[PDB]
Amino acid sequence: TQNYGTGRRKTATARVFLRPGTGKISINNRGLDQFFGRETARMVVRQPLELTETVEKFDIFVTVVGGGVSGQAGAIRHGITRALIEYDETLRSSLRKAGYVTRDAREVERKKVGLRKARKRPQYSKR
Amino acid sequence: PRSLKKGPFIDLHLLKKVEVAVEKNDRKPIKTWSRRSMILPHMVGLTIAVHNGRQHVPVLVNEDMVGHKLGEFAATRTYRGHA
Amino acid sequence: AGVNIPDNKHTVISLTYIYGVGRTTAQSICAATGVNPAAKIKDLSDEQIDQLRNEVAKITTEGDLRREINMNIKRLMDLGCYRGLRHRRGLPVRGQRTKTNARTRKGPRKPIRK
Amino acid sequence: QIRIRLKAFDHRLIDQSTQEIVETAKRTGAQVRGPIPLPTRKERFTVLISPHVNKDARDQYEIRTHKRVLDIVQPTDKTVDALMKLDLAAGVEVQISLG
Amino acid sequence: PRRRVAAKREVLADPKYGSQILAKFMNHVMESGKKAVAERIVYGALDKVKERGKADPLETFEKALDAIAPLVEVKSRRVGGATYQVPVEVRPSRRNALAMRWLVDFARKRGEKSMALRLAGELLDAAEGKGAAVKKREDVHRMAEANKAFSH
Amino acid sequence: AKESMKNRELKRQLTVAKYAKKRAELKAIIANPNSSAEERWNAQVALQKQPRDASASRLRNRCRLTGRPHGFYRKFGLSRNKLREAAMRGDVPGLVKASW
RNA sequence: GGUGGGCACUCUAAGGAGACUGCCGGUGACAAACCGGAGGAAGGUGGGGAUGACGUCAAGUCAUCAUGGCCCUUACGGCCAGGGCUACACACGUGCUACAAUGGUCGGUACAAAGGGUUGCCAAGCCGCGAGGUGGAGCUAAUCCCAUAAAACCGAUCGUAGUCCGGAUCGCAGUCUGCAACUCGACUGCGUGAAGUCGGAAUCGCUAGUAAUCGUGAAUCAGAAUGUCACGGUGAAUACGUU
Ligand SMILES: [Mg+2]
Ligand SMILES: [Mg+2]
Ligand SMILES: [Mg+2]
Ligand SMILES: [Mg+2]
Ligand SMILES: [Mg+2]
Ligand SMILES: [Mg+2]
Ligand SMILES: [Mg+2]
Ligand SMILES: [Mg+2]
Ligand SMILES: [Mg+2]
Ligand SMILES: [Mg+2]
């Protein structure tokens, strides 16, 4: 059975497998809270699952590579959205209204010559 | 500073001109250019004229300069004063 | 109470003030001579101030340390070596910038002529 | 069980060489997996262009190195040992291992 | 901008309370991207408010912002030879921004053990108006009547 | 980039390369913990025997066409203001302009 | 994933599809176009880069190079030892660190990207508080090494004091490369501990992964980066308007 999804965000790539269950939630074979330490990451992961009142309807097994905690949380959200829509293909409109399937295309801007940061410049005294 | 793996450092011709010197007591300053060489307590009392850039300044060695190099007792920049 | 020690402070911090002890050797004295670092020196018993006095008198402090640094400084000066002259004028001795930014060894700006 | 490693500067030559060697190996009776591509090394250089003082005027150049891997299952015909002059022509370097 | 094509992004990521103003206050108190630090500081402040204040802390929060928001704002315009000031009604969206900024910048200047209980102190003071933020609000308000002559 | 100066760095290259072995042996014996102070000291004397113009520190690499002491790229052999000239003509293999 | 094994997935790298105001509504001189909507990962040149017209400033470079003239030829040409370019009553530009409690310490703790390495990286082990030393493994490298990210989170402590802040300066003792660390190197150990209480006239950078803040890598190079170039972590506020 089961379904699959992939979520990418902020150089973070996550794979999600969805099976029947009640939402044990395993992050690289680890407890959800043992991974997400004192942050909203748990809630942002649970956002799309709870938007469709299916928190206890499924069990989730995921893995994550690359990026920071916020990027991995966003990747989990996107991946579980793409996995859930693969099961109940009538809620695509609901997620489109919620704007969860849409990927975040923002990415770090490269540094350029003559500048300190990607856009910061020196002070420019005129005399 | 130089590691403990190497105790002294002396110009070899300086070593030969000091070791041969001690056969007789202090009678003439010894002319030297290598400011880098260490000085041990075995040329104490000898007067060494160390090169400074335009002249050989003579300095009389004592026992209380074993741990300081030849160049420390010769100044190369004058700075007589702004006014 | 040592030599003009403060109170209401942890043992190591209080010990640090005696000019010859910092964070490391204060911790060593605190651990060796059995005392609680958490316990404030105010509530420490008289059984420990004598031990701390022994530890303080063991190494160095105050007058001897001032005298030996001053002896070293005059030792450098009287010979006439480069470092001695550098410390004589008050200019930096390690060899930092003197064209500018050598302020802590010159004082205020002291503008020209007047 | 031999493995062939290909180094190149531009992918245009390396793709042609890999296709040629794969076709020859499959035609001669050998068994060959799928050409494996490796991450391409990118060497970055930045150089002043003015002959005198202009620090903000740079030029950035890049050297790309492409890596390919192949394997031969059931080695039956060593005809590839008579074709190096043809398999590698101008800018492709070929290494053969585990003969 | 002369073009006026710059649209605005919408942020709503309340972790547990599920409100709107709370997140914007989070951003206001957030410094150098320390979002979790802001989380814990503001939540400790709100816990102190909840233990001190009998009712829920969110309506106390909105009441406090109700007493800090300035109704009108004065803004200097130069007539071409004299430096005047002109009172204008504040944009409805701008009221919340001024409220949040003033409350944060005034909670920053107490001087007690931390700014969590500072934020609590000015949150309760602004709940009826004995703080310093309300002092600046009423001063700016009274400057309008002080300059009602021009208005137009 | 006077040609006498290029000559006197090339001669430095030969002088450095022509020993290439006494330096290694002497320094290895010096750095060997179990060699006795006598073999420390004679090795120091031996190192001080040979001319100073033998070490790699005295060797300042230079452009192979102009000899500019500054602006060097050791992946190539050219200077700052000849690498670009050769690259724009396509002489350097696999060199292009980068954007990413 | 350690093993047998698989071609599911991530990923790596080649070739393609896709975004073209394409469809619907209104405005519009029934034109160009504008304002909305649906779908879609992406919507209005999607984001960033490379790309710099005719010419101006007798703009910069004769010292990278080449070249018309002029100049010296026992010297303005060559070689070698030391010294200086790191000097110091002052002034200015560009930066780093702070003046603290959204902090400083202590314990264990989770997640990056990019890159360099066979005249090289240099592991395990052992000896040192320590910078390091012996040792010799693996690697021509998605295979071995550099290499443990940090800010973040939890608990304990300090209680706003020029201080469990801040580190300049200085004294003593050391490690390492180098023929050689005085002039004139980088780090390490103990101790000393300054100015600094957020900065006048004036002035600067920035519109979304932006500012701010946190760490990592490469070039030059025996050694020497708060500089240059490059990569990711967290991550805002504001724009009514053109006098
Ligand atoms: Mg990038
Ligand atoms: Mg950045
Ligand atoms: Mg200025
Ligand atoms: Mg010439
Ligand atoms: Mg060199
Ligand atoms: Mg649209
Ligand atoms: Mg001109
Ligand atoms: Mg010379
Ligand atoms: Mg200079
Ligand atoms: Mg401190």
Q: How far is it, in rounded angstroms, from Cα C58 to Cα C25?
A: 12
Candidates D49, D63, D65; nearest CB to F84: D49
**Helices E21-29 and E35-52, axial angle in degrees (round to 10):** 120
Experimental method: cryo-EM
Strand G contact nucleotides, protein CB < 7 Å: 8-15, 35, 39-42, 46-51, 60-61, 63-65, 77-84, 86-95, 101-103, 110-116, 133-134, 141-142, 149-154, 157-160, 164, 168-172, 174-186, 189-194, 203-213, 219-223, 228-243
Q: Where are the alpha helices (DSSP H) in B12-81?
A: 12-19
Q: Are E152 and E90 spatial neighbours (Cβ–Cβ below 8 Å)?
A: no
Q: How far is it, in rounded angstroms, from Cα B59 to Cα B39?
A: 12
Rounded to 5 degrees, what angle do the CA atoms C3, C7, C11 make? 80
Q: How far is it, in rounded angstroms, from Cα C57 to Cα C49?
A: 12
| Cβ within 8 Å of residue C68, ≥6 positions away | C60
Q: Which of D50, E130, B56, B21 has the alpha carbon at shortest distance from E138?
A: E130
Q: How far is it, in rounded angstroms, from Cα E150 to Cα E140?
A: 16
Residue position matching structure tokens 């703080």: E131
- Computed over its alpha carbons, how large is the radius of gyration of chain C? 20
DSSP label at residue F53:
T
What tokens were used for D28? Answer: 């001669």
Q: How far is it, in rounded angstroms, from Cα A78 to Cα A102?
A: 8
How far does the CA of A121 sit from the C1' of G227, in Å? 15
- What torsion, rounded to 10 degrees, do the Cα atoms C12, C13, C19, C23 define? 60
Deposited resolution, Å: 2.7
D58: chain A residues, CB-CB within 8 Å: 113
Q: Are E141 and E95 spatial neighbours (Cβ–Cβ below 8 Å)?
A: no
Q: After which residues is chain C broken (C to N over 2.5 A)?
A: none
